[PDB]
Design a protein around this motif. Structure first.
Motif, PDB file in Angstrom:
ATOM      1  N   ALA A 126      -4.740  30.429 -46.903  1.00  0.00           N
ATOM      2  CA  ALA A 126      -5.247  29.077 -46.717  1.00  0.00           C
ATOM      3  C   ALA A 126      -5.176  28.316 -48.032  1.00  0.00           C
ATOM      4  O   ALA A 126      -5.391  28.889 -49.103  1.00  0.00           O
ATOM      5  CB  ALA A 126      -6.689  29.087 -46.200  1.00  0.00           C
ATOM      6  N   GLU A 127      -4.875  27.021 -47.946  1.00  0.00           N
ATOM      7  CA  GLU A 127      -4.904  26.120 -49.096  1.00  0.00           C
ATOM      8  C   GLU A 127      -5.776  24.924 -48.744  1.00  0.00           C
ATOM      9  O   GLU A 127      -5.432  24.148 -47.847  1.00  0.00           O
ATOM     10  CB  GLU A 127      -3.490  25.668 -49.477  1.00  0.00           C
ATOM     11  N   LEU A 128      -6.900  24.767 -49.446  1.00  0.00           N
ATOM     12  CA  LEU A 128      -7.606  23.493 -49.460  1.00  0.00           C
ATOM     13  C   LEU A 128      -8.037  23.183 -50.888  1.00  0.00           C
ATOM     14  O   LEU A 128      -8.538  24.075 -51.591  1.00  0.00           O
ATOM     15  CB  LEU A 128      -8.847  23.528 -48.554  1.00  0.00           C
ATOM     16  N   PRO A 129      -7.850  21.948 -51.348  1.00  0.00           N
ATOM     17  CA  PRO A 129      -7.870  21.693 -52.801  1.00  0.00           C
ATOM     18  C   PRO A 129      -9.256  21.835 -53.414  1.00  0.00           C
ATOM     19  O   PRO A 129      -9.434  22.639 -54.342  1.00  0.00           O
ATOM     20  CB  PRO A 129      -7.337  20.252 -52.918  1.00  0.00           C
ATOM     21  N   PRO A 130     -10.290  21.076 -52.943  1.00  0.00           N
ATOM     22  CA  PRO A 130     -11.520  20.981 -53.741  1.00  0.00           C
ATOM     23  C   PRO A 130     -12.681  21.836 -53.251  1.00  0.00           C
ATOM     24  O   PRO A 130     -13.723  21.275 -52.898  1.00  0.00           O
ATOM     25  CB  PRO A 130     -11.859  19.489 -53.646  1.00  0.00           C
ATOM     26  N   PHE A 131     -12.558  23.157 -53.217  1.00  0.00           N
ATOM     27  CA  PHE A 131     -13.648  23.948 -52.644  1.00  0.00           C
ATOM     28  C   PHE A 131     -14.032  25.152 -53.500  1.00  0.00           C
ATOM     29  O   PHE A 131     -13.412  25.419 -54.528  1.00  0.00           O
ATOM     30  CB  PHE A 131     -13.278  24.404 -51.232  1.00  0.00           C
ATOM     31  N   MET A 132     -15.059  25.877 -53.062  1.00  0.00           N
ATOM     32  CA  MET A 132     -16.291  26.016 -53.836  1.00  0.00           C
ATOM     33  C   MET A 132     -16.345  27.349 -54.572  1.00  0.00           C
ATOM     34  O   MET A 132     -16.371  27.383 -55.802  1.00  0.00           O
ATOM     35  CB  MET A 132     -17.519  25.878 -52.933  1.00  0.00           C
ATOM     36  N   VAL A 133     -16.391  28.434 -53.800  1.00  0.00           N
ATOM     37  CA  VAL A 133     -15.882  29.750 -54.196  1.00  0.00           C
ATOM     38  C   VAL A 133     -16.547  30.239 -55.476  1.00  0.00           C
ATOM     39  O   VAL A 133     -17.769  30.362 -55.540  1.00  0.00           O
ATOM     40  CB  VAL A 133     -14.342  29.750 -54.355  1.00  0.00           C
ATOM     41  N   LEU A 182       3.001  32.468 -38.600  1.00  0.00           N
ATOM     42  CA  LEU A 182       2.474  31.253 -38.002  1.00  0.00           C
ATOM     43  C   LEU A 182       2.122  30.254 -39.097  1.00  0.00           C
ATOM     44  O   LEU A 182       1.861  30.626 -40.245  1.00  0.00           O
ATOM     45  CB  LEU A 182       1.237  31.550 -37.144  1.00  0.00           C
ATOM     46  N   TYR A 183       2.120  28.974 -38.730  1.00  0.00           N
ATOM     47  CA  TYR A 183       1.898  27.904 -39.692  1.00  0.00           C
ATOM     48  C   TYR A 183       1.129  26.777 -39.017  1.00  0.00           C
ATOM     49  O   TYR A 183       1.359  26.476 -37.843  1.00  0.00           O
ATOM     50  CB  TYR A 183       3.224  27.379 -40.259  1.00  0.00           C
ATOM     51  N   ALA A 184       0.217  26.160 -39.767  1.00  0.00           N
ATOM     52  CA  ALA A 184      -0.339  24.868 -39.395  1.00  0.00           C
ATOM     53  C   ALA A 184      -0.695  24.092 -40.654  1.00  0.00           C
ATOM     54  O   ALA A 184      -1.128  24.678 -41.650  1.00  0.00           O
ATOM     55  CB  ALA A 184      -1.576  25.025 -38.503  1.00  0.00           C
ATOM     56  N   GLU A 185      -0.506  22.774 -40.602  1.00  0.00           N
ATOM     57  CA  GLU A 185      -1.006  21.868 -41.631  1.00  0.00           C
ATOM     58  C   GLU A 185      -1.601  20.641 -40.958  1.00  0.00           C
ATOM     59  O   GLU A 185      -0.909  19.954 -40.200  1.00  0.00           O
ATOM     60  CB  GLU A 185       0.111  21.461 -42.598  1.00  0.00           C
ATOM     61  N   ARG A 186      -2.873  20.361 -41.240  1.00  0.00           N
ATOM     62  CA  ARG A 186      -3.502  19.106 -40.852  1.00  0.00           C
ATOM     63  C   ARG A 186      -4.424  18.632 -41.964  1.00  0.00           C
ATOM     64  O   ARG A 186      -5.176  19.427 -42.537  1.00  0.00           O
ATOM     65  CB  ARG A 186      -4.297  19.249 -39.545  1.00  0.00           C
ATOM     66  N   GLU A 187      -4.366  17.331 -42.255  1.00  0.00           N
ATOM     67  CA  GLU A 187      -5.163  16.682 -43.307  1.00  0.00           C
ATOM     68  C   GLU A 187      -4.908  17.427 -44.618  1.00  0.00           C
ATOM     69  O   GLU A 187      -3.746  17.718 -44.931  1.00  0.00           O
ATOM     70  CB  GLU A 187      -6.620  16.598 -42.870  1.00  0.00           C
ATOM     71  N   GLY A 188      -5.938  17.748 -45.401  1.00  0.00           N
ATOM     72  CA  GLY A 188      -5.745  18.484 -46.636  1.00  0.00           C
ATOM     73  C   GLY A 188      -5.432  19.954 -46.473  1.00  0.00           C
ATOM     74  O   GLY A 188      -5.082  20.609 -47.459  1.00  0.00           O
ATOM     75  N   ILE A 189      -5.544  20.486 -45.260  1.00  0.00           N
ATOM     76  CA  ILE A 189      -5.605  21.925 -45.028  1.00  0.00           C
ATOM     77  C   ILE A 189      -4.216  22.401 -44.627  1.00  0.00           C
ATOM     78  O   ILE A 189      -3.663  21.947 -43.617  1.00  0.00           O
ATOM     79  CB  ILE A 189      -6.645  22.276 -43.951  1.00  0.00           C
TER      80      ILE A 189
END
Length: 247
Positions: A221-228, A167-174
């Protein structure tokens, strides 16, 4: 920083992938730990220096590395942090490290060590995580004998021994992908944010709800600027998970 065999194999595989290895071979018997390496390996001048990077050169430690433009390769043997001396050895380019009775010289570390099967499962789960993270790198694992998988694109199907729908989804940065098979008698829910694995149990119960209750789910998941244990901007991510579970 070590305390366990699974942290030994964590550090040695971590240096291995830092070395641009495309092949990582881990052997445990529960005693030796062995990690054999495809990577660039160590210059001979630095072989004695790096042992005093790895410490966990206590306990009972042996390394050999050939640097990839060196024709020779070098092996150092130490015991309990004191060097038992070195020799040259013909080897392929890479590194082997052998561990071989962790915590022999320090009890009450060694009595902290868990049951044989428990440490074995910890090492197995860690190699699973490194494999699911790195599709382009071979991994092999030995316990009695192997666990093995090669360079792939869907590697989820090899490690979990089942066929998955993607399955796949892309919306906004995500951008987020999922691999789901349906049955396997057991829930297994895996989630990777960037390439880093996440054990957060809230997300796994959410995945239980929106996907099936006994289901395999592997979510990249790919989101660029997060915290971890990690922090993100939660609502749009979780509603995107609600989306692509509608296929």
């Amino acid at each position: 920083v070590i305390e366990s065999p699974v942290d030994v194999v964590k550090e040695l595989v971590e240096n291995s992938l830092d070395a641009k290895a495309t092949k990582v071979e881990v052997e445990i018997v529960k005693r030796l730990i062995r990690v054999k390496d495809n990577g660039t390996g160590i210059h001979p001048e630095d072989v004695e220096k790096v042992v005093l990077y790895s410490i966990s050169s206590v306990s009972k430690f042996k390394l050999r590395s050939r640097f990839f433009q060196e024709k020779e390769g070098k092996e150092i043997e130490v015991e309990a942090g004191n060097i038992l001396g070195t020799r040259r050895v013909g080897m392929p380019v890479g590194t082997e490290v052998e561990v071989r009775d962790l915590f022999f010289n320090l009890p009450v570390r060694r009595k902290f060590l868990k049951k044989e099967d428990t440490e074995r499962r910890k090492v197995l789960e860690l190699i699973k995580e490194y494999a699911l993270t790195n599709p382009e790198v071979e991994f092999t694992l030995f316990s009695e004998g192997r666990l093995k998988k090669s360079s792939l694109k869907e590697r989820v199907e090899e490690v979990f021994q089942t066929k998955t729908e993607e399955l796949y989804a892309e919306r906004e940065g995500i951008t987020l992908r999922a691999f789901v098979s349906r049955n396997q008698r057991q829930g297994k829910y895996y989630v990777f944010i960037n390439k880093r694995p996440i054990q957060n149990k809230n997300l796994k119960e959410f995945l239980r709800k929106v996907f099936g209750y006994k289901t395999l789910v592997v979510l990249y998941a790919e989101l660029p600027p997060f915290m971890v244990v990690n922090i993100l901007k939660e609502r749009k991510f979780l509603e995107l998970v609600r989306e692509l579970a509608g296929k």
